[PDB]
Design a protein around this nucleic acid. Structure first.
Ligand code: ZN
Ligand code: ZN
Ligand code: ZN
Ligand code: ZN
Ligand code: ZN
Length: 138
DNA sequence: TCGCCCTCTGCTGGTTAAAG
DNA sequence: ACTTTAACCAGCAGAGGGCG
């Protein structure tokens, strides 16, 4: 148990605590030699270098499209070649979304606070949430 | 042990097609 | 028959954990 003093992270390996702390300090030791990207750990630099090398190690076994990362391919297979996958229902409206991160986009765009407000395009009423604005305009 | 490799996670911007 | 818009999607970068 090697505990971070700054959060609840803990590990059974000293080296993992050292890596974790760079998330607080922002130290990025592993620099790309071709662009400005730099990583906190060795793996994400190698994964990034695949984009310079053109290395695409992953191939969809159904349609043979090729991918640079494994999770990209997995998501492609889930969304394009799989039926009856559970969908994301927004709690604040009736929209249904296929991907969790797209639900995130929707929450931030439609249900977040707009400090400077937005006026209806047909009337002088002002709203501070896009969903309420669009509902009013209708 | 720790470099290596896996996985789960999550934002961005181009495309597309639907609504009004 | 045109704009506006937001989900769909590939792409890329975030982290935590097992093990030879
Ligand atoms: Zn911490
Ligand atoms: Zn680079
Ligand atoms: Zn495929
Ligand atoms: Zn919603
Ligand atoms: Zn109005």
């Amino acid at each position: 148990p090697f505990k971070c003093s700054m959060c609840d992270y803990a590990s059974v390996e000293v080296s993992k605590l050292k890596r974790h702390i760079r998330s607080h300090t922002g130290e990025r030791p592993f620099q790309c030699s071709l662009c400005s990207y730099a990583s906190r750990d060795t793996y994400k630099l190698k994964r990034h270098m695949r984009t310079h090398s053109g290395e695409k190690p992953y191939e969809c076994y159904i349609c043979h499209a090729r991918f640079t990362q494994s999770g990209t391919m997995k998501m492609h297979i889930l969304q394009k070649h799989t039926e009856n996958v559970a969908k994301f229902h927004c709690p604040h409206c009736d929209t249904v979304i296929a991907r969790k991160s797209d639900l995130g986009v929707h929450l931030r765009k439609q249900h977040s606070y707009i400090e400077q407000g937005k006026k209806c395009r047909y009337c002088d009423a002002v709203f501070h949430e896009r969903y309420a604005l669009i509902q009013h305009q209708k």
